[PDB]
Amino acid sequence: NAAEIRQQFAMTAGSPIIVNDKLERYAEVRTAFTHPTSFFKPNYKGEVKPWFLSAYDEKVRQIENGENGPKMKAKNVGEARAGRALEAAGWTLDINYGNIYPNRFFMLWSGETMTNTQLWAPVGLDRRPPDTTDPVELTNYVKFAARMAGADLVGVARLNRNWVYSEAVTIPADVPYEQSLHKEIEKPIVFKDVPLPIETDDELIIPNTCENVIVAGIAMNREMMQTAPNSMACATTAFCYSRMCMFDMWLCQFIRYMGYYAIPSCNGVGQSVAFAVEAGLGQASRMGACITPEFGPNVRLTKVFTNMPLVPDKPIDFGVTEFCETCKKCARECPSKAITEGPRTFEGRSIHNQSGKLQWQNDYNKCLGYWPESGGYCGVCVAVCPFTKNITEVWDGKINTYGLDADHFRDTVSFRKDRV
Amino acid sequence: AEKEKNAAEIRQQFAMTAGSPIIVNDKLERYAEVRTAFTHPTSFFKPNYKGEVKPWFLSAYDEKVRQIENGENGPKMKAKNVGEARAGRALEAAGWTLDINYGNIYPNRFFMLWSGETMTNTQLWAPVGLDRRPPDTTDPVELTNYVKFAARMAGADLVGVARLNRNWVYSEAVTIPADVPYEQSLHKEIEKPIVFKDVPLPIETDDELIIPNTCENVIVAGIAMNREMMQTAPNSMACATTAFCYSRMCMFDMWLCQFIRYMGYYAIPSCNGVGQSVAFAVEAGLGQASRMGACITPEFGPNVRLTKVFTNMPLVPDKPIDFGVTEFCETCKKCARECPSKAITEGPRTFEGRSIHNQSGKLQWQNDYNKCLGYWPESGGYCGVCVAVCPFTKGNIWIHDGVEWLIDNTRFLNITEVWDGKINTYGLDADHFRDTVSFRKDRVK
């Protein structure tokens, strides 16, 4: 009974993230995916390329050699091909591995130009003032909508601006997709007294009225993630990124048609793990992920920012911090030794970490370096974590819609009493 | 003791020998898509509640607005308050986010591209060459297992394979010229023939949509709707589960087409376009046709949406299923009695279409689909009362008698609570989700 467990472990109100007076908002360019010190990696031939192009070279090499992963023979070349075809297809509704550019492509900050909004314009739902301002009813409505939109977990928190990127990585508005990767730029995210989210030439402007963040958990497939670092773990990762994108769009449209505004984000705008912890989805862990009672860390996160009045959820403590202090299994299994075996500190290990918050400090350039080597997105830490509990057998074995598991799907049933 | 329900056993018990179960005669011709009630000039226009004659969906918009202002969730159906009325229409409208003009029917436009070459995902992945490398698997048995696994990842609750029967492919599609932007699309619709020719890849010219003669197979997906919400038909929450499933259909088509392309084959998406989904679903064994005209499945009854993808990927066709729907529909008639427009016949099946909207030459129950569409502006939604009242839509129809499975004949003798009630991811129901579990023996024999 997940509803039992979650109420049993509810904390009193208040962000559980411990900060000091040195904490500053973090520039998105500093992540290992984007920072110039980490973006380039060698491929297996010794050629230095953007990390994902070197990883592509390893995927091709593996298919040619009939492998599903590094030193992991597939049943045959056909099976190797199928795993990479499934992975590539999963990313269909995602731009450049994460949808990070705000107010571009799928991540529009206004619904006005969307084909769906245009078709529905005669009804005027996005221009009519709200008919409901009660946060209790709105919380029930928007959480119901979030489940329809594909969230397996949903939570609400007040927006902590500490976790919003100081500056986003984006592209100029008129740059076509084919030039996007070569024309990424940095752009400040600022808060101002304005009626609606708006982007100028100089700034991404979030209204000061943007009170709340809605955080969704999108469950990955257990059998597929257990093949990490091989291709089927890459495929469940990929499919869930497209599920994230559809969730954001559906939910933003619902909120707009209720008379409020909504900012989608997927992997952009801010740090999902921090939002997820403050919204009570789970607890932060040694590997750096939000660990949930239902899925452990084997769940993806996305979030939507809104002025819709809502009731914040309570943070939860089910003992993850104390379990991680003695466990260290992810740190021992990590192929790049990226994950620390030491205690939590306020001091980042490198430019990629945000200093000023008490956390396990991991070396995320070491992690990214393993991705071209293995030809994937690893995930071994997620796979081995106790809270999460060959490839031919996966393809021949159990599956169900969206990779969900009917042995556990009852755990995410929801009634009004657990929504608000 | 009660035998634990087993959807795979049920499908195995009622499997037929190979062969299209649809009975046809010499009158059969391919059907021009413009003839559907949504598009034909005789049915496209409907009065609104003030008597003004408009495109059907604009007259229905007028009724949605009227209901919200009057605090109603449907025709004569009072909501708890105006905010609840508003919330149901906001959910319905949002559900349609990934669907163009109520069904994604224009082929090779917007989401329904016939080639992946211009897609942002294909461009990002181009260095791997998955869409240019020849197939590494040509064995239909392994391909069927691979593609059905992918189909489940892509959100299908049911998946089946049939050889493509061109009788159900539209003779001419409804589409728009390639230079027309979205905001003009509804004013610029045209017809364009769908033809089969000896070409290597699906291709569109100025004059024709060309499907290769190598396009052997159709993959049909069932996308389950939510039972609690459909039971509110014809009110707004039934409209919302309908809408959300159309966007699920779109995601399914794009995901699966990309998988098939990255396996070295071509793939044509369709959603509500290209051809007649119910006929493909019957031939792929998802279910049986019914009095209301829908495909009734063992797992969901007719409370399931359909989409399909066409491909040259070698595959193993599934067997059709006969679990007695025809004989139950012969005596049931509940959808005909409850239909608010009297669109559904109470008579026998014939080969003769009731009107231009029906394709003559196939043995089916002939329904008046102009009457159906006429109730949509009146009710401000997409009705669905027939789906809601069908006994097969109940979750509880199957019983085991110690020897075999059978249908319980006894089954044939508000919105606030929905918003406050049970829900789960994508509106799926964990009490029944085990019914769609799949292993290799389910996917290919």
Ligand code: SF4
């Ligand atoms: S994804 Fe792999 S390399 Fe990265 S931290 Fe986890 S185990 Fe280590």
Ligand code: SF4
């Ligand atoms: S593997 Fe152990 S130490 Fe690492 S995150 Fe999981 S519980 Fe914590």
Ligand code: SF4
């Ligand atoms: S309501 Fe009765 S007659 Fe109509 S489709 Fe269902 S079983 Fe057939």
Ligand code: SF4
């Ligand atoms: S949708 Fe409604 S009007 Fe149309 S056939 Fe079904 S019950 Fe009749």
